[PDB]
Amino acid sequence: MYYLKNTNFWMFGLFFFFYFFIMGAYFPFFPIWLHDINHISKSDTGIIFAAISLFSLLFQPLFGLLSDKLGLRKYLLWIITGMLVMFAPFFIFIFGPLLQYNILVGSIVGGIYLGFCFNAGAPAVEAFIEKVSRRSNFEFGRARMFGCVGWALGASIVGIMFTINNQFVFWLGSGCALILAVLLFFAKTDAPSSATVANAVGANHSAFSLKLALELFRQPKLWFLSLYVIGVSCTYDVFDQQFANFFTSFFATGEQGTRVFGYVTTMGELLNASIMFFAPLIINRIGGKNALLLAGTIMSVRIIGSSFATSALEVVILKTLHMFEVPFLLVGCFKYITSQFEVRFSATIYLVCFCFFKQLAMIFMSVLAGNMYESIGFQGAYLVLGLVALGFTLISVFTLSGPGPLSLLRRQVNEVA
Numbered sequence: 001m002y003y004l005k006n007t008n009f010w011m012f013g014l015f016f017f018f019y020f021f022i023m024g025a026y027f028p029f030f031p032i033w034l035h036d037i038n039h040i041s042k043s044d045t046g047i048i049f050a051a052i053s054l055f056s057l058l059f060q061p062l063f064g065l066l067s068d069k070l071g072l073r074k075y076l077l078w079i080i081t082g083m084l085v086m087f088a089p090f091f092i093f094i095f096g097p098l099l100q101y102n103i104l105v106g107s108i109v110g111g112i113y114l115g116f117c118f119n120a121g122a123p124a125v126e127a128f129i130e131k132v133s134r135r136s137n138f139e140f141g142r143a144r145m146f147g148c149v150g151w152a153l154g155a156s157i158v159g160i161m162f163t164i165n166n167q168f169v170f171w172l173g174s175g176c177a178l179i180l181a182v183l184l185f186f187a188k189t190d191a192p193s194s195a196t197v198a199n200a201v202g203a204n205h206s207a208f209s210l211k212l213a214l215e216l217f218r219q220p221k222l223w224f225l226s227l228y229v230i231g232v233s234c235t236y237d238v239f240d241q242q243f244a245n246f247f248t249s250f251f252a253t254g255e256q257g258t259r260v261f262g263y264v265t266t267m268g269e270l271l272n273a274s275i276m277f278f279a280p281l282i283i284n285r286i287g288g289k290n291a292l293l294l295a296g297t298i299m300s301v302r303i304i305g306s307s308f309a310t311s312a313l314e315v316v317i318l319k320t321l322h323m324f325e326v327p328f329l330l331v332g333c334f335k336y337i338t339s340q341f342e343v344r345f346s347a348t349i350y351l352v353c354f355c356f357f358k359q360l361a362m363i364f365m366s367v368l369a370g371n372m373y374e375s376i377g378f379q380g381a382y383l384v385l386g387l388v389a390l391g392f393t394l395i396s397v398f399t400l401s402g403p404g405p406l407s408l409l410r411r412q413v414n415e416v417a
């Protein structure tokens with residue numbers, strides 16, 4: 001409408017419906033392809049999802065220094081794309097072999113960089129795209145809920161495709177989503193207008209200092225969130241690493257236990273989208289902390305729950321819980337962080353607690369998770385994590401800063417208005 005003649009909306013919206021069609025491939029069916037197509041150690045998928053986190057942490061950062069000190073040049077974001085023209089050659093001809101030709105540490109390391117154009121590129125893409133929403137007038141959130149259908153159709157299509165042939169994907173994702181999610185450039189923007197003639201605006205900014213850090217470090221309420229963050233999350237995070245094959249087991253053909261999976265995920269948007277609607281409202285009445293516990297109570301139940309699975313139906317209810325949670329989490333982390341911290345801090349709070357610490361707590365965790373799914377298989381390991389996760393959760397109905405104890409409108413309603 002207000003975008004019909006608006007072209008970069010189409011451009012970057014479509015660029016969003018392609019960067020996320022690939023996501024919808026590479027991500028949910030990673031476990032499957034690894035372990036099945038490649039047949040890989042129930043504990044060595046850990047040394048992979050492991051190197052995965054150790055780098056998304058060496059890049060999520062350095063990618064800031066680019067994402068902005070670079071501004072409107074697609075440059076960086078063009079490496080990302082070109083690197084994704086080789087999705088195929090890579091897994092098929094390099095990633096797959098390296099691992100499998102059982103040289104595996106020296107194959108993930110040297111193969112966990114096409115994880116760079118995903119872990120610390122997926123957000124990176126999402127930035128650049130809003131810097132355009134500005135200059136070009138889109139409700140960024142109108143073009144991002146564009147790349148949401150792509151990851152919905154992604155899963156569905158891909159899964160069904162995947163079975164039929166794992167190969168006829170890395171070739172689809174490497175073109176179907178590459179040559180376009182790349183060709184969507186020769187038609188773009190740069191113009192130092194629609195911002196300020198000089199530099200009065202153009203691309204929102206912020207700061208992350210040492211003292212800032214050293215200040216938070218002084219703060220306990222930072223620590224208690226660093227508790228919930230490393231405790232409930234990181235832990236849940238890895239729960240999902242492997243979970244996909246633990247899924248496919250409760251099914252007829254494994255080559256049917258996939259599709260279903262691709263389905264449970266496609267229906268996620270079709271769920272989470274709705275959930276997301278109310279959410280705020282709710283979050284803002286329930287009060288952050290509470291809603292962060294709400295998320296651990298589930299996260300938690302899903303782990304323990306899974307540790308007691310017997311059938312398929314159950315397992316297709318655990319994979320559906322992961323959905324209610326998420327909303328109440330990121331949206332919760334947001335509303336708590338904010339209701340509990342100095343806006344100046346906010347920036348740093350994320351990098352420091354949500355990127356440096358969790359990815360760290362995961363470089364380690366997902367190794368003893370795989371080393372654990374061996375000595376005790378899944379369901380056993382699930383009891384461990386399930387408890388450690390719920391434990392911490394009760395510990396937070398205590399630690400996390402309640403609903404504004406020494407300020408309810410100056411440290412709770414202040415940022416609000």
Ligand SMILES: [Hg+2]
Pocket residue numbers: 021022025172173174175176177178
């Ligand atoms: Hg694709």
Ligand SMILES: [Hg+2]
Pocket residue numbers: 230231233234235361362365
């Ligand atoms: Hg952890």
Ligand SMILES: [Hg+2]
Pocket residue numbers: 145148269272273
């Ligand atoms: Hg969505």
Ligand SMILES: [Hg+2]
Pocket residue numbers: 329330333334354
């Ligand atoms: Hg968050």
Ligand SMILES: [Hg+2]
Pocket residue numbers: 057058060061351355356
């Ligand atoms: Hg980091």
